Amino acid sequence: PKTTTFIQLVNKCLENIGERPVISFNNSVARKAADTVRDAITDVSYSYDWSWLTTSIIANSWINERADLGDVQSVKHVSYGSSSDGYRELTFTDERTFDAAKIYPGVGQVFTFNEYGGVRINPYPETVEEQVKYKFYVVKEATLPSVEIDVINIPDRFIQLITYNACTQLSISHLDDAQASQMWNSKYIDQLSRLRARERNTTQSGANMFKFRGTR
Amino acid sequence: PKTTTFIQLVNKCLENIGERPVISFNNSVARKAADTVRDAITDVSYSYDWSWLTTSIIANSWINERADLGDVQSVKHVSYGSSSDGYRELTFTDERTFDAAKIYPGVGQVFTFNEYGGVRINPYPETVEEQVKYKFYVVKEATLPSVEIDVINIPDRFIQLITYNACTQLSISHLDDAQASQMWNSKYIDQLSRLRARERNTTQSGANMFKFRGTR
Amino acid sequence: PKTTTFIQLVNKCLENIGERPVISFNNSVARKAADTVRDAITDVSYSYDWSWLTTSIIANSWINERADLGDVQSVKHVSYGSSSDGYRELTFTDERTFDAAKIYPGVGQVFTFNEYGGVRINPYPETVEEQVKYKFYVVKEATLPSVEIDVINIPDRFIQLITYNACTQLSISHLDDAQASQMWNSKYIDQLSRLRARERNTTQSGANMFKFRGTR
Amino acid sequence: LTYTGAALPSNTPVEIRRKTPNSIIQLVTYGQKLSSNLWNSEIDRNIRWREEV
Amino acid sequence: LTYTGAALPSNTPVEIRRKTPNSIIQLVTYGQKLSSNLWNSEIDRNIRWREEV
Amino acid sequence: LTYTGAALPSNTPVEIRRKTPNSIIQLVTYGQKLSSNLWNSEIDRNIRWREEV
Amino acid sequence: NDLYVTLDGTLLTPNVDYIKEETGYIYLLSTFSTGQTLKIASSPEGNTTPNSWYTVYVNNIRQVSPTPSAGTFTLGATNGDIINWGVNYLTIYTTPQFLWNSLGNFKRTQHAYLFLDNRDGVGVYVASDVNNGQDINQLTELYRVPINFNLSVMYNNQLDGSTSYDVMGYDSMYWDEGVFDVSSPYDQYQPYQTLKIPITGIGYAFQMLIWNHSDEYFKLGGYQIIAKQKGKRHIGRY
Amino acid sequence: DGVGVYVASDVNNGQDINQLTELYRVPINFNLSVMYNNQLDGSTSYDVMGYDSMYWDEGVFDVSSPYDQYQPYQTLKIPITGIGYAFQMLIWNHSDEYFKLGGYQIIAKQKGKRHIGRY
């Protein structure tokens, strides 16, 4: 599960690169290792659309027609409705076509991206009961730990992948050893390739080139 | 059988890499060897859909319509029923199509993946008697030992593969010997190639491109 | 969010290149690191049409027919109208075709580029209420911080990419180490490739080769 | 804030106040760098509690 | 203190209290010189507010 | 806590509550050092007073 | 942790209640008052065995040191037994610092090979050394001169190094570690021994101390350190 | 010689004991100038041991400033970027501060013969 802490991950990376254990981020070695581990976590999050990063959420806040989703890697789909009534997908349009129509309150039909972390929906909801009826299919960013006792919000069985990436970056930074960096990178790339090839978001029996859009 | 212990595997890896066998994980080389052995076990588990990892289980716990399967590498198929009545396989749908329908209690017809280690089934069971009729065809994660006297939940005829992988990683980390790591990796890759070519989940007589999906 | 400071990024780069973290840009290495960080921010801004750089704005100031947009990387589209009435896109013409017609006040129909940071619109608005009705789809420049406590106007999940680029340039300049520069460049290029492949401005379902131009 | 509890009756007067927890952000140890951010955060928490009271 | 307002009624009791404002004197910036005066001032602000409460 | 006082009537409900004194741990008049003990002591006194209130 | 620190009789923690510094100072981390008594005594085995500063032999058998009372201690030995007791002293050999002629380049150490001469320790007690009808099996095949020492390696001019404590092995019999018919440690019985101690660490300068603070004897005949050279990426200890 | 600090028994005439206690008896700090092309207009790094007073985000807890003085043996890496056919170092001081240089090393790279002169 999620039981690995930031200090343990830093210590694992330090022993893998060849340094002594630490008890806190009070020295420069542990500080640089913590920064490297945060960078490696972000890189592993960017490497794939992981199941522990993909989720369906509602908007954090709403401006008139722009809903703010905070810090997410990307937005895949937008739906309107409830679980007891069903969800209807909204059609994606580019910004120019979205701006070509009047922006008025109502029930959402189209959506577009506005700057960073924002989705503009037309027609837009004006009440909270209507705002909470919109589902956003997003890929979350990895939560970065800050202190020693912070529990990493990543399953324990990807900690070795994170360790390989952090060890590559630590061989680059702390040791400046290209051979060790290449070896750790080879480990990381092989691990990531197998993980991405084996863990996909659909089943083999469901992997098909035919999708039933509609008959209109 | 499953009679190999974590301390024995660590001692084997240490003796192969050139260190003295230990009686406990008290010094740095033994701790690093234990961590490397856990990483190698995870790597071997991810290398293939092993027979000692493939199994059929029921959900650990249920939220209203989401079943939590704990930590499994992948979910292959979902079935409803009992052994005295037969099992009917559910049809996989993507999240957008799954959310397009009303979620109500009943007998499961479709399923999808939700976040990490969770399967959403519609219609969903509301009682434990109905919940225990759902079979999940999953690939388990490798159980990682925690102390010296823990018995590894892996047959002893794959301990040599695990040892080769652990020796590769230990040559990377401890010895800093690219040539030794390459030799151990060649041994591991050749062993794994033969094991995967000879050990498959269907027989040669049953290996066919035709599967009967019945005249819908 | 946007909580990373210029001094924090400079200290990160200094630690990554092997220098002691500073509290102010007082020594030559800190000044060089600050200049390199600003250059890397500009480089990352030039690398892609980032969502934190793309926006729709109005003109900063107007000369008779020339609207000044300040310092923007490029201008994509120009629209006229309001949000409650809709926006109509203007047609782009080359400078020679634009100059072939009379320049008179009115409602904008065509636009062109004039020198640096300027768009000429014909017909042009003469009042502020008509000037504020023009929307420019531009790609902004990256805002460069000036002092230690300035907050970088970039989300915290691109700070590591900026750090990789700044470390490449710092390996070129300060360390004079081609191998370290190549290692940092490989890290930066790999992460940038993944980011550009995964974070685009349209969805996969919206990515189509057909765009509707309406039956002129 | 997001409510995920039981369905409230119609027009329930929901009231939200602020209550800063009485807890330390972090213990500083031997050899720890003096953190201006930590000092500001502790002072801000004290100010928040005083304003709440 | 001085007073400048409306005429009070017959021998009205005015009773002045102390109310320390809930605000930070200085926001400590990054890499700034440590100020013993500022440290003591912040601690004294907290102590004064506690004593008034 | 021992009691050495006057005679107490039978079945007297004695209640003990905690009350952190409102005083400085020590004044900072130096600039060559800053002790984590002092930092944690001031923060702990503040937190203790907040909890008691 | 070679100190026994008491504050008004209360035992303090080596890292939670105080700090052992590199300059002969003890830094107090906890809260204390003026006028309290701080006693720092020599306890080489730490807070667990405060009486470990002296060794007691009863019939050439090392005993657990009892707690002294007013500078005097008592033993539950049989009348006529020979008792030898004395104070332990600290023995240290320090190697010259190795920097590979570079003040900035890291050196990751891999192994330390120590060549020890055990000819003075391969002697054992015989049945004719029994006194006052003691347990003959406790004395016979027992090494007259025990051999064991500690190896500490420090990096980057700092004194917070990594220590391997008992490199010759255990002085008692352990399952899956001891051998038959050879008294523990079995590495002592070889007249000339080579010990391979893994010392994994990174620093621009590394240094070894071979030390001891017990009744044990060592005779280092040589040493060798294996290391690899890395980049100049040292920043400091804080 | 500089890792020694003042104790509470050194207080005189009831002075501020906190200003004296944990204060280094012998301060250690110096200036480092690097001189190029036989010209005396060198580049100087002024306080290499660090500040003698506590600074936010720079000083450490429970260690008197400078915290680099409290290590019995210290290695300082001063980055000195410059171009010249001849370079030279001056370790100097003009205060009540003490230093004891046990060794030094310069890292440099070679470039091909393009010196023209000072003016």
List H residues 41-80 in contact with F (Cβ-Cβ < 8 A): 52-54, 59, 61-65
Q: How far apart are CA C23 and CA C27, in angstroms?
A: 10
Q: How far apart are CA B72 and CA G159, in angstroms?
A: 46
Q: How far apart are CA B63 and CA C13, in angstroms?
A: 47
Q: How far is A199 from chain B (nearest CA, A)?
A: 6
Is the Cβ–Cβ distance between H106 and H89 less than 8 Å? yes
Find chain F residues with C-beta within 8 A of E47's C-beta: 22-24
Q: How far apart are CA A46 and CA C16, in angstroms?
A: 21
Find chain E residues with C-beta within 8 A of D47's C-beta: 22-24
Q: How far is CA A137 from CA A72, F15, H30, in A?
A: 10, 57, 61
Closest CA to A205 of B76, C194, G219: B76
B54 pairs with which residues across the strands? B139
Q: Any CB–CB contact under 8 A between E16 and chain D?
A: no
Q: Any CB–CB contact under 8 A between C20 and chain H?
A: yes
Q: How far apart are CA E14 and CA C189, in angstroms?
A: 73
Q: Any CB–CB contact under 8 A between H112 and chain G?
A: no
Is the Cβ–Cβ distance between A114 and A120 less than 8 Å? yes
Eight-state DSSP code of residue G66: P
Residue of chain G whose Cα is closest to the Cα of D30: G29
Q: How far apart are CA G54 and CA G49, in angstroms?
A: 11
Q: Of E22, E27, E31, which is closest to D50 when you measure between CB atoms?
A: E22
Whose tokens are 């970065």? That residue is A144
Closest CA to A12 of B173, C185, G11: B173
Q: How far is D37 from chain H (nearest CA, A)?
A: 9
Peptide linkage before A123 cis (omega within 30 of 0): yes
Q: How far apart are CA B113 and CA B94, in angstroms?
A: 8
| Sheet arrangement for strand C72-82 | C54-57, C134-140, C72-82, C86-89
The CB density around residue H47, as the number of other CB atoms within 10 Å, is 13
Whose tokens are 């050439």? That residue is G60
Residue D31 to residue A27, Cβ atoms within 8 A = yes
Q: How far apart are CA G54 and CA G213, in angstroms?
A: 10
Residue C18 to residue G231, Cβ atoms within 8 A = yes
Q: How far apart are CA H10 and CA B26, in angstroms?
A: 46
Tokens of G173: 């019999």
H35 pairs with which residues across the strands? H88
Chosen for mutation from E26, E29, E30 (greatest number of chain C CBs closer than 10 Å) is E30
Tokens of H38: 């036989």
Residue A20 to residue G236, Cβ atoms within 8 A = no
C66 pairs with which residues across the strands? C120
Q: Any CB–CB contact under 8 A between A147 and chain C?
A: no
Residue D33 to residue G238, Cβ atoms within 8 A = yes
What is the Cβ-side half-sphere exposure of residue A17, based on CA atoms within 13 angstroms? 38
Tokens of B21: 């066998």
CB burial of residue G114 (10 Å; 0-12, 13-18, 19+) = buried
AA letter at D46: N
Burial of A130-162, coded b for 16+ CB within 10 Å and e otherwise, reads bbebbbbbbbbbbebbeebeeebebbebbbbbb
Is the Cβ–Cβ distance between G233 and H77 less than 8 Å? no
Find chain H residues with C-beta within 8 A of E37's C-beta: none
Q: Any CB–CB contact under 8 A between D30 and chain H?
A: yes
Tokens of G189: 């019985």
Closest CA to A169 of A44, A62, A25: A44
Q: H/E/C letters for each residue in H36-104?
A: ECCCCCCEEECCCCCCCCCECCCCECCCCCCCCCCCCCCCCCCCCCCCCCCEEEEEECCCCCECCCCCC
Find chain C residues with C-beta within 8 A of G233's C-beta: 18
AA letter at G172: S
In this structure, the strands spanning A110-113 and A91-92 are: parallel
Find chain G residues with C-beta within 8 A of D30's C-beta: 19, 27, 29
Q: How far apart are CA C112 and CA C99, in angstroms?
A: 10
Q: Provide the sign of the torsion angle of the four alpha carbons A49, A52, A55, A60, taken in this order.
A: negative
Closest CA to B53 of A157, A132, G183: A157
Residue of chain B whose Cα is closest to the Cα of A139: B115
Q: How far apart are CA B47 and CA B195, in angstroms?
A: 11
Peptide linkage before H66 cis (omega within 30 of 0): yes
Identify how the structure was determined.
Answer: cryo-EM
Q: How far is CA A136 from CA A197, C157, C202, G209, in A?
A: 26, 21, 15, 62
Q: How far apart are CA B42 and CA A187, in angstroms?
A: 13
Q: Any CB–CB contact under 8 A between H119 and chain D?
A: no
Q: How far apart are CA G151 and CA G210, in angstroms?
A: 5
Strand blocks (E) in A17-106:
54-57, 61-62, 66-68, 72-82, 86-89, 91-92
CB burial of residue B143 (10 Å; 0-12, 13-18, 19+) = middle
Q: How far is CA C109 from CA A95, C69, C105, in A?
A: 19, 19, 11
Tokens of C195: 């980011």
CB burial of residue G67 (10 Å; 0-12, 13-18, 19+) = exposed
Tokens of G110: 């891999």
The CB density around residue C65, as the number of other CB atoms within 10 Å, is 22
Find chain E residues with C-beta within 8 A of D50's C-beta: 22, 49
In 3-state terms chain F splits into helix, strand, coil percentages (rounded to 5) of 30, 0, 70
Contacts 24+ apart (CB under 8 A), G160-166: G161/G209, G162/A20, G162/B28, G162/G199, G162/G201, G164/B27, G164/G197, G164/G199
List C residues 63-82 in contact with A (Cβ-Cβ < 8 A): 77, 79
Number of residues written out for chain F:
53
AA letter at B13: C
In this structure, the strands spanning H31-36 and H43-45 are: antiparallel
Is the Cβ–Cβ distance between C108 and C78 less than 8 Å? yes
- The DSSP annotation for G183-234 comes to PSSTTSSSSEEEEEEEEEEEESSEEEEEEE-SS----EEEEEEEEEE--S--
Q: Angle CA(G156)–CA(G158)–CA(G159) in degrees, nearest 5?
A: 140
**Chain breaks of chain A after residues with C–N above 2.5 Å:** none
The CB density around residue C210, as the number of other CB atoms within 10 Å, is 4
Q: Provide the sign of the torsion angle of the four alpha carbons G62, G67, G69, G70, taken in this order.
A: positive
Is the Cβ–Cβ distance between C145 and C124 less than 8 Å? no
Number of residues written out for chain A:
216
Residues whose CB falls within 8 Å of the CB of residue B128, separated by 6 or more in sequence, listed in order: none
Report the Cα–Cα distance between both ends of chain C, in Å, rounded.
45
Is the Cβ–Cβ distance between A72 and A55 less than 8 Å? no
CA trace torsion C142, C147, C149, C155 (10° rounding): 10
Closest CA to A185 of C183, G227, C189: C183
Q: How far apart are CA B196 and CA B47, in angstroms?
A: 9
Q: Any CB–CB contact under 8 A between E49 and chain D?
A: yes
Q: H/E/C letters for each residue in chain E?
A: CCCCCCCCCCCCCCCCCCCCCCCCCCCCCCCCECCHHHHHHHHHHHHHHHHHC
Q: Angle CA(B49)–CA(B51)–CA(B57) in degrees, nearest 5?
A: 90
Residue G238 to residue D31, Cβ atoms within 8 A = yes
In this structure, the strands spanning G26-28 and G54-58 are: unpaired
- Give partners of F (≥3 CB pairs < 8 A): D, E, G, H
Q: How far apart are CA G126 and CA G183, in angstroms?
A: 13
Residue of chain A whose Cα is closest to the Cα of C17: A173
Eight-state DSSP code of residue H34: E
Q: How far is CA C208 from CA A73, A94, G163, in A?
A: 22, 11, 65
AA letter at C130: E
Q: What is the largest CA-CA distance in chain E?
A: 58
Q: H/E/C letters for each residue in chain B?
A: CCCCEHHHHHHHHHHHHCCCCCCCCCCHHHHHHHHHHHHHHHHHHHHCCCCCCEEEECCCEECCCEEECCCEEEEEEEEEEECCCEEEECEECCHHHHHCCCCCECCCCEEEECCCCEEEEECECCCHHHHCCEEEEEEECCCCCCCCCCECCCCHHHHHHHHHHHHHHHHHHHHCCHHHHHHHHHHHHHHHHHHHHHCCCCCCCCCCCCCCCCCC
Q: What is the largest CA-CA distance in chain C?
A: 65
Q: How far is CA A184 from CA B171, B176, B178, G67, in A?
A: 12, 11, 11, 55
Whose tokens are 């002790």? That residue is F35
Q: How far apart are CA A164 and CA G228, in angstroms?
A: 21
Find chain C residues with C-beta within 8 A of E31's C-beta: 7, 22-24, 148
Q: Any CB–CB contact under 8 A between G235 and chain C?
A: yes
Eight-state DSSP code of residue D29: -
In this structure, the strands spanning G3-7 and C86-89 are: unpaired
Tokens of G187: 């590495």
- The DSSP annotation for C110-179 comes to EEEE-SSSEEEEESB--SHHHHTTEEEEEEEPPPPP-STTPBPSS-GGGHHHHHHHHHHHHIIIII--HH
Find chain H residues with C-beta within 8 A of C174's C-beta: 79, 81
Residue A163 parent element (H or E):
helix A159-170
Residue of chain G whose Cα is closest to the Cα of C180: G231
Q: Of F34, F40, F43, which is closest to D34 when you measure between CB atoms?
A: F34
H28 pairs with which residues across the strands? H98
Residue C56 parent element (H or E):
strand C54-57
Q: How far apart are CA G186 and CA B20, in angstroms?
A: 14
In this structure, the strands spanning G26-28 and G38-42 are: unpaired
Phi and psi at G127, nearest 5°, equal -70, -15
Q: How far is G18 from chain F (nearest CA, A)?
A: 11
Tokens of D15: 């009231």
Give residue F18's Cα distance to chain centre: 8
Q: How far apart are CA C176 and CA G75, in angstroms?
A: 72
Residues whose CB falls within 8 Å of the CB of residue A73, separated by 6 or more in sequence, listed in order: A45, A46, A53, A138, A139, A140, A141, C198, C199
Q: How far apart are CA A11 and CA A33, in angstroms?
A: 9
Phi and psi at B29, nearest 5°, equal -65, -40
Q: Of G162, G176, G200, which is closest to B23 when you measure between CB atoms?
A: G176
Q: How far apart are CA H81 and CA C176, in angstroms?
A: 11
Q: How far apart are CA B75 and CA B58, in angstroms?
A: 12
Residue of chain C whose Cα is closest to the Cα of E33: C23
Find chain A residues with C-beta within 8 A of D26's C-beta: 147
Tokens of G221: 């005949």
Q: How far apart are CA C108 and CA C96, in angstroms?
A: 18
Q: How far apart are CA C145 and CA C152, in angstroms?
A: 6
Residue C18 to residue G236, Cβ atoms within 8 A = no
Burial of C29-49, coded b for 16+ CB within 10 Å and e otherwise, reads bbebbbbbbbbbbebbbeebe
Tokens of G11: 């035992």
Is the Cβ–Cβ distance between G83 and G58 less than 8 Å? yes
**Chain breaks of chain D after residues with C–N above 2.5 Å:** none
Peptide linkage before B21 cis (omega within 30 of 0): no
Is the Cβ–Cβ distance between A42 and A144 less than 8 Å? yes
- Give partners of D (≥3 CB pairs < 8 A): A, E, F, G, H
Q: Any CB–CB contact under 8 A between G238 and chain C?
A: no
Q: How far apart are CA A15 and CA G39, in angstroms?
A: 38
Q: Any CB–CB contact under 8 A between F37 and chain G?
A: yes
Whose tokens are 């921010």? That residue is C41
Eight-state DSSP code of residue C206: T
Phi and psi at B179, nearest 5°, equal -65, -45
Q: Do chains B and G touch (3 or more CB pairs under 8 A)?
A: yes
Tokens of C170: 């710092």
Is the Cβ–Cβ distance between F53 and F19 less than 8 Å? no
Residue of chain A whose Cα is closest to the Cα of G108: A18
Chosen for mutation from C15, C29, C172 (greatest number of chain H CBs closer than 10 Å) is C29
Residue of chain G whose Cα is closest to the Cα of C179: G231
Q: Any CB–CB contact under 8 A between D42 and chain F?
A: yes
Q: How far apart are CA A48 and CA C199, in angstroms?
A: 12
Residue C28 to residue H77, Cβ atoms within 8 A = no
Q: How far is D32 from chain G (nearest CA, A)?
A: 8
For A33: left if phi > 0, alpha if psi spans -120 to 50, otherwise beta; the answer is alpha
Is the Cβ–Cβ distance between H86 and H38 less than 8 Å? yes
Residue of chain A whose Cα is closest to the Cα of B170: A16
Q: Any CB–CB contact under 8 A between G231 and chain A?
A: yes
Residue of chain F whose Cα is closest to the Cα of H20: F30
Inter-axis angle of helices C6-17 and C159-170, nearest 10 = 50
Residue of chain A whose Cα is closest to the Cα of D35: A26
Residue E24 to residue D39, Cβ atoms within 8 A = no
Phi and psi at C44, nearest 5°, equal -65, -35
Q: How far apart are CA G43 and CA B214, in angstroms?
A: 82
Closest CA to A31 of D37, C12, D29, G230: C12
Eight-state DSSP code of residue C192: H
Q: How far is CA A162 from CA A43, B36, D49, G61, in A?
A: 9, 14, 39, 54
Q: What is the largest CA-CA distance in chain H?
A: 66
- Give partners of G (≥3 CB pairs < 8 A): A, B, C, D, F, H
Is the Cβ–Cβ distance between C161 and C94 less than 8 Å? no
